[model samples]
Target chain A: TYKIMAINAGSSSLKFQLLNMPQGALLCQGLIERIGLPEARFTLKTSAQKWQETLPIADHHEAVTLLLEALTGRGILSSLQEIDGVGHRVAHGGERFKDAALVCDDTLREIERLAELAPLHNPVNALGIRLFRQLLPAVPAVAVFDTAFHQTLAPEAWLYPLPWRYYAELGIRRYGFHGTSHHYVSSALAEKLGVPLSALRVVSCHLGNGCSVCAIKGGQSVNTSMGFTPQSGVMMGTRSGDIDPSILPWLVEKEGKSAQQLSQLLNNESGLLGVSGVSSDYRDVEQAADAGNERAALALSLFAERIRATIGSYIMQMGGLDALIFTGGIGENSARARAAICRNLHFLGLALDDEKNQRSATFIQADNALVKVAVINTNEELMIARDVMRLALPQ
Target chain B: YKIMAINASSLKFQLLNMPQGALQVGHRVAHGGERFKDAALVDTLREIERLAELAPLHNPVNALGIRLFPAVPAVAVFDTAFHQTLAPEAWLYPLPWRYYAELGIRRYGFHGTSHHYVSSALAEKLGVPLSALRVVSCHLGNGCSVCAIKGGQSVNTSMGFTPQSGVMMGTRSGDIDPSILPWLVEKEGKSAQQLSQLLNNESGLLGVSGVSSDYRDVEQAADAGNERAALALSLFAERIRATIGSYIMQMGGLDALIFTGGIGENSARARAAICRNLHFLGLALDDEKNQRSATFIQADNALVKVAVINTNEELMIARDVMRLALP
Candidate 1:
């Protein structure tokens, strides 16, 4: 088995996870934050120990150099030659790269071209790929796209009801994100259920800081919650999921806000924080709700209700659901949110085992549950590593 | 009941030709906000003028109608009155609370006259009391909305602050990502007013099909293999189906699904397309009955009853007039 490192680089930060590929064992993980700042903090964690440092990291290139240097110094890797491959998580694949690709010059150029679709992500991701390639020229690099898995979505499912010319000319359609996580979880769920994924109609709820509900029919995403951008789905920590499109014009007339400012408001200041006037964290909102805060309670209910409605719509769209999978931060840890979502869904034959739900059990469905309800912890880094092994390995 | 299709502006002119013998008028006011839950007597013209801020398109004309018939005891049968029973969770949007608190922004679902009429008619046809049913009423005319009615009270609906929301209609885009507006404004250099006009008057079936907004014309064009016309019809049916599914979830279960208004009562193709794969929800269309526009079109063993009830808003309005003015 080869050792593959999965890199997820943001605008000002980079997160890397090293996994023993094929075996799926984590060797080490690290993060470099505030990359362009004077006090750039770096942290690495291994099974036996943890390390952290503060330094003046100039850019992603410097950050990559420091990471390689630290791995060598820490004795995790005796030489850079031991690392078999690098898997980079590129956010927007656009209509290209339906599957993970070997990062050639063409792949790099295409990723740069798709930057217009994912402005906050593709550029930084390309930078990471370029730096990684510069540092380790011999390593095979694979570009794993967040929008790749959802490329299987049918045109009817992806195309918005806008003018056909918008999609025909401008490529404005639903390119769902969090594909790596959704793919990981769905596979994990299939394994847990001891059934082939193709036989099961599943809906995977990836409820993290950025949430999306994917409708997987016969192991492919037929429909998803997020569209065009990540901002148009179920409500999230700071993003308003879906609102009346008319509200934007009304907001402009009322507040005289610019387009960028309105976009910022919808993307940053809305959702749980905007509704409750409290912290954006679900835990904080739940606690405030418990403390009898009306707005907090309202926010929590709204979030659950919106998710429930979406689940219902997806269920209808899928004809029938054989299993309901919950994964990610809120999905994995928060039993209350799970319970709230599954409360009135008994009509759809989903019965949650309260005791099993309270605990983090693999199968949380009740004895009489007609559908399998599962909590599969998603591992995108491991999935990326596997994709790297699959593509980079010689048959 | 007399079906008087008189324009709101020409109410006084129409009165001259009518056989006026203690005629009590009932006006259909569009927005009742959180206040009026039922029909109210229009005792003062000032009160009607004050509520015009909520429904600028309809209330002023409604007030003018009331002023024209000042001698008669007129009633304001609100189109939003039935939806006042919606829970706060269903009514409130997940926006900044100040906008809702300050600007009176919340879901005030329209078409109460049609929703109420069809729901009651469905219950009556079933030979059950209105309190015994959970009905999802779909009013799909030029304007469309789906209402979740439980125990004869509106629990949730598709329309929001304005009729411009909800499923796509003749010329309305219905529900879209709010960000699309600002994006369009920035990209297309269109003002908010212009964008609003585009969304409200130049979008939906008319805009997408590049044809007439009338469903009949769209259907004929679609039958003739016009791809855009087919796309518009498909999108319309899909949005309506999704909203229907959402309402069923909101009401926990649906006992009856009532289809009314122009498109609902007439378009058999639209109905079949909508109910095509809804067997998972135990809703199956009886093809023969559906094609013939029969009143009851669901399969015998289907869990949910599917009905096409002709909406009689005028009769409901007249009933309200009798209830208030005669009392």
Candidate 2:
């Protein structure tokens, strides 16, 4: 019925995925990487075709211009006009827009205001929205946010055990990230499990370069690991997981590290690297661990232990889980990571079929396991495309 | 020419009993209330009077011990004396200075008897001299504490302010909502003494499991798959794990962790339960090795050696005798 483009703009790059709207098929996807660097790289992948190149681009606006030019040149889109509508992947919608909304002056203002809450992403997201509106003046742009789906979280689930004043004054509360992916994957998982969304107590593990676990009960986010910001959850590729806030002060006093320096350490140099003093890549760590590297082995074990603990806590909170769904890069690709995560989970009745686990299959759980486990790759861009089609082109 | 070991098994006796040095009775004094930093011979009436009110239960008894043993030299061994070498910041509670002055309230962990005993015992078992070793003394009795001892001196301890503040003990609440005290008193119709009794006699393994406070009893109930008992034991072990982690973080590292006291010395299951799923900490229990229940229970890859040593506070009391009497 329609062709749509979902534009997800990052701080230094832009990603666009084109989809056949009514069927929700991802026709093609591409990235405009290194937007501000001396040479910006561009890569695009259609269902059966792929392309990659590098060129000099000044900023986000220029990058968008070049991306549009490449799409047209490749004959994927005859012209910019063939794209019916644009869906912008806005990172933070705050509490204002509980769902995706039409990109307008008010929405832009709200997004800008919410930038404080999402310091790393929102401002760049707002810029992407602005650049797209300028490039495609006639296209009705829809802003699909990453925080919108988690708005259904209850007060108790979202609230920190901290003083109420922190929330009242600064809006310091849990606003879980990866809403688009969690929303899409969880709903799809429920369908694949042949159960009604309301019946399934789903825990979507969106484990990627940046990972988080979203707990969905009755198709609503009951709780999520992320809070206020992306730095609150389990240890990611580089970010430190949950640490005693007191350690920041202690580290500062002891190491003479500034807040910025410590933040860099927490956000980039910590987690697996800090714990093991080894490479950040899980595969590299695993390989080294296989070669009898003690630190790497320890780091890998630590990663798995933390995830297991989180899964146990979630299962305890939910009373029990109906299904455990894995998504994102590491979750889908890394058989070892998946196996390690589910190794000791027998106590929770969530066991993985080791043979099935080693393969890239959908159902990864052991046959006798009480809890169903599956690996489902997320398509947030398709979700965004659908949103754009519904909101901007209702006809 | 005798040796005696006195252990303060519970929290009630704020009083002390210092037996004569020659009589060799071990005296475990709580905090010695800041008046005496190290175990020494206290003969002056003024020094005894100064320390009187701090430990209402123990100081008077300690003074009596000193007085009654005038025919022979009497030595005062303090629970806090081992921790005298602790850095000021480590010992100082984050509170007003006046609270320290008025109430002698700070993190003066009791159970120095077990901590001292275990550290030395662990050193001996590990074939190392006490001065050459750094140890973490986990005294898990009816009352619990995890002391980080480095260079044969107490560096840090988990118990804060009182014995009632550490890991869940027999009946003590361990750590509770601080605000719950006043609220319970005002609303729950509990008097101060009643509340203290509830915290010290009705809480912990007993309250959580709804079973007996004794670890052995809890273990039996847990083995029968009593969910509450299992939950209580699980929480208790988790608390210990978290404290050991904190101690390791505080010291930047640890050389060894020694388990002592009643429950810690005896409970193999509890030990296994704590060390399970902690391979990330480079701690992996050798099931066969652990079954032997030797003085040391070092895991295969344990970055810091783990040992279970029987604490003999009486021996330390004898050592205190030699140290105080010489010169």
Candidate 3:
């Protein structure tokens, strides 16, 4: 058995999950939040205990050191020597690493170079890898990329309808994220169905705070909703997904808004929040919608409608679908969201068992469903841990 | 019954004879606002002028044609009339309501003349009433649009706000992330006008291929081992396919698919590539039939009938003018 550490380092925060593999049991999990601030927050949770505090984390290095110290100091593990490998989550690999890789000097430099594509992510991810390596010099580290799973996308699906020079020179193309969750969910569904992932045509809906729909045919990503940046794809908490790109110029002309201001508005002030004129949280919006707020109801309807269309588009892209899988905070828990998205999909020979749907079962399809409907609890952390064990510590 | 069906231009007219319908002459106006469910007999030129502000670029010129033919009983056919039936949900964008409520910044799909004409033709070809079918008509000209028509009315469409929106065309980016424009302005330091100009004139199949704006040139290049040319066509097909999927969802199901306009009526290759994987929609392309530009491209056994119709807006205008003129 190997003890693997999975780390997701954002710009100002670090999330860590410790698992005992190959059994994949969670030993300890926690996060270092507000990392560069004066009063940074830290939380650690285990089966038997929970710990949290506010202190100055200073940087990712400090966060890493603090977490490592807590692992032994809190008696979760006997020593730091017990940990076999670590996995780092880098947001954008930029066509560099097709899949997860063993982190080394070259890989670190690559992660550094690709930081231009995801400014808030790769820098800290690289920093976390370096810090972990210093703390456990002999332990191996691997890098799992958010954009890795989607690198298998064909040229037809990835190429934007812009000039080829943009793709050749500036790297402007579709690079989808939430790949680990999509990969994990698809694999999970494949496993439950007792079939090789390569044997199935699947569409995965990863609907969390940031939403994206992926089209996978025979174990490879054919296309995705999110494109170029996080700003594209289905509507998210506060980001308007794909609008007519022409809207930007019109807005710029009519309102005289600067590029920076427009970006801020689109990325932080749109989607459910923009349409509803209410809170950005889907739950809050759902509550308001349930209570008969017309705009809230409109926002929820728009959200469902957009996702339904995206799912429909993928079904069209793949020609036919063998299965449709839903996972993530929204996808896993919200029956209303699932029902709304699946409402008109009856034309595709897909039907949901309302009893199974309300209870959120693993397989929610009706007895006569032509396309299997599944709700999987995506284990991105376990996926990261498995990759760590496979690539970094090959025992 | 020799009626003149004159299709007006940016500043031109193409007069044709097909009377059962004449221009005593009928004029084609680009936008009829939310009014004018059917063709209007121009008793008052002021009403046409009142709707002028909605489509400022083309209406004033359209009104000029009506007055120029004042000696005859003139009828006006509108481009936006067919899509006035779009439900609020399909028409509204995910943007703030005020943008739509105040500025009229909602989906106003174009190509109403072609979509209406072809879909109506599709209904007749199937020997069904217009009220019984759900059809997605793809008007793939230099300007392209995919419209979802149910029961003879447009439910939703690809084009929105402007003709340059929706399905990627010869020189249009269609539905983009909307963030690209502001980001490009910051990265490239171009003004919004310049960006809009680029999107309108420099983007789409021409922008991607880096060859020519003409589809024939790009298709030929693609045939001659040009990867960019192939990529451009693939992008066009992918966007068109996806837009059709969304339309199918809006209407719950699809009964038929219609292809019209310049590219749609001719490019069998484009048609095949578009429905390549979507056979599940019962859009099985008969290779030989499609290759020869047959009226019904889909196989006889196919559940959903895929059709190709030569769009004659002038003829449609003539028929509409006659329909309202005689009745």
DockQ of each: 0.57, 0.04, 0.68
Candidate 2 structure quality by residue, lDDT tens digits, A1-395: 68899898888879898888789878778888888887689888998989988878788988888878887988888888998999999887878988999998999998999876666788998898898888889989999988999999765455433323434565756788899999999988887888888998888898886788888888798767776667656667777655433233333444555445655665677666655566778778778889988767766766665555456445544546788888998888888888877765543467888788889589989888888888998988888988998899888
Ranking of candidates on lDDT, top first? 3, 1, 2
The parts of candidate 3 lying over 4 Å away from their true place are B5-10, B16-24, B32-56, B63-75, B323-326
TM-scores of chain B alone in all candidate structures, in the order given: 0.92, 0.87, 0.93
lDDT of 3 by residue, A45-117 (tens): 9989999999988878888889989999999999999998888888999998899999879999999998877
Cα lDDT computed for each candidate against the true fold: 0.84, 0.71, 0.85
Better of 2 and 3 by TM-score: 3
Evaluate candidate 2 and give its CAPRI docking class based on DockQ.
incorrect
| Candidate 2 TM-score, C-alpha based | 0.61
Interface RMSD of 3: 1.4
Interface RMSD of each: 1.5, 13.5, 1.4
When candidate 2 is compared with the true two-chain complex, its DockQ is 0.04
Clashing pairs in 3: B3-B22, B3-B23, B4-B22, B4-B23, B23-B26
Candidates' chain A TM-scores: 0.98, 0.95, 0.98
> What CA RMSD would candidate 3 show?
2.4
